[PDB]
Design a protein around this ligand. Sequence first.
Ligand SMILES: Nc1ncnc2c1ncn2[C@@H]1O[C@H](COP(=O)(O)OP(=O)(O)O)[C@@H](O)[C@H]1O
Ligand SMILES: Nc1ncnc2c1ncn2[C@@H]1O[C@H](COP(=O)(O)OP(=O)(O)O)[C@@H](O)[C@H]1O
Ligand SMILES: [Mg+2]
Ligand SMILES: [Mg+2]
Lengths: 273, 273
Amino acid sequence: AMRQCAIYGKGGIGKSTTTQNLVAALAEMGKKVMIVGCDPKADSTRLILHSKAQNTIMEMAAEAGTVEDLELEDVLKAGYGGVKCVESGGPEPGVGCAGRGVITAINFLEEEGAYEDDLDFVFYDVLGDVVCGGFAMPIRENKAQEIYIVCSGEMMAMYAANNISKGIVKYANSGSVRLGGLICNSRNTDREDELIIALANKLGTQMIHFVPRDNVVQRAEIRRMTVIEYDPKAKQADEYRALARKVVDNKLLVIPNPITMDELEELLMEFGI
Amino acid sequence: AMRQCAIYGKGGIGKSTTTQNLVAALAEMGKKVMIVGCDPKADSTRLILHSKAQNTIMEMAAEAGTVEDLELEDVLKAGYGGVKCVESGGPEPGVGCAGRGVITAINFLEEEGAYEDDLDFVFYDVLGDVVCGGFAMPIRENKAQEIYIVCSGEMMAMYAANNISKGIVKYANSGSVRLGGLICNSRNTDREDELIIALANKLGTQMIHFVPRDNVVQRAEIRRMTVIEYDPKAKQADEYRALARKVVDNKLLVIPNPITMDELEELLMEFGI
Ligand SMILES: Nc1ncnc2c1ncn2[C@@H]1O[C@H](COP(=O)(O)OP(=O)(O)O)[C@@H](O)[C@H]1O
Ligand SMILES: Nc1ncnc2c1ncn2[C@@H]1O[C@H](COP(=O)(O)OP(=O)(O)O)[C@@H](O)[C@H]1O
Ligand SMILES: [Mg+2]
Ligand SMILES: [Mg+2]
């Protein structure tokens, strides 16, 4: 078996930094992991591959003729800890549907046998500002059973978490997609941990980890690495190791309870952020 | 004539706060303005209307039967300074296309004669994390001739500005949609103004104004008002008045020059943010 997890959240909140560092810690632990980038920014694998980014399935299919002319060994690339990496891509802005590459990529990976038994985890890194088209497909089509939402005390980040939760509820009658937890990516504000714990409780889930804001992230990313690889002794490395451990051990997967706008505003008012 | 302007940018960057405060300053100046909300969050008019939010065209059409059973006087609501307000709405998460309500709303407003000659400005407040579907329609279908992008020194906010610019270039052979400027909504970081000026120059536009981060915004919004209405003597009120004046006087509308990821990273590296 393998656990299929998707990391959702608003743009800029820390999905790709958190996912790649979490996955590096899992690989350091001995797990076999694949990352599938589902964000048109297409830089969700650069820290594993030590790269600028990664050429996308959409791009490679266009140069090869069809997606059928691609081989899995041409598209999947291995980096730190043997983590396997692939990027979906998407159409250029103003053209088509921004999420159409996610559908092409996930179907290609399934057909070409990328979901080999020795994998322990697959992580999809998914744009979450809209929940439609290919960005909704991991939920609609039962591709990611465990959704973890990266957020912060920022109202827009919590709004996005509630919006993604509504999409999970909408498809609860089919498949087995569930909310596994919230990950707080700190803005270095007071009581922020308590705020995200309270939001998780209202939704029916948990805060799986509070990730501190730490400048070592920027120093590692300037060098195209995870903190795990760049400085294994860093305090922040131990934070990602704690997050990875709790994801491995997590057994709470729920159909969430989305909240009203009044509840959100009451949370922010109360915690004085 | 009326000037048709759209405010784009990543989620949470300050589109709705900036737009409503800019428009309030325009109304204080004697201009007649309409705001059209084109973001599914649907709170783009609350500070003009002193409201929680505003019921959307999608919602009202569903309760009335069809969009044809709606009258313009039922949908448009006037608030501070006589500013007229309407919200598009959108489908619930996981269902349909998140931008489909924008198409319905703009077509309804055009057909029902909302673009009456005495209007001086229309502002569309548009989600900009993806440029597709209804969110691309103001550009694709020539609805907003003047695009102003709210951003900040945050890499994701500048990436979004570049992405929106690519969509403008894609439709430059038809209609007259142009980039009018960047608005820096400060994160209170050093040389941030210089950073956004440099980005604007690379794209071929200008920084039309640097909006400071000021807690009076939160104090005004807790009371469902613009800063213009809440505290007309505030320093921040004068900032929005300066922004409004420069939008009125702006004559630079360009087909922008999108930049590469290397150029963006060089900007951040250089300005040491
Ligand atoms: N815990 C953290 N501490 C410091 N910087 C962070 C942290 N998490 C994310 N960042 C920075 O935030 C920016 C955006 O993160 P990213 O993972 O690219 O967001 P997303 O993938 O959600 O768009 C990156 O520059 C990243 O280095
Ligand atoms: N200049 C500013 N100073 C202080 N707070 C701001 C400023 N601009 C925006 N905000 C706050 O940022 C948050 C998001 O702004 P908003 O306009 O709702 O973003 P968007 O419409 O782009 O999603 C709001 O809570 C708003 O009060
Ligand atoms: Mg990312
Ligand atoms: Mg808004």
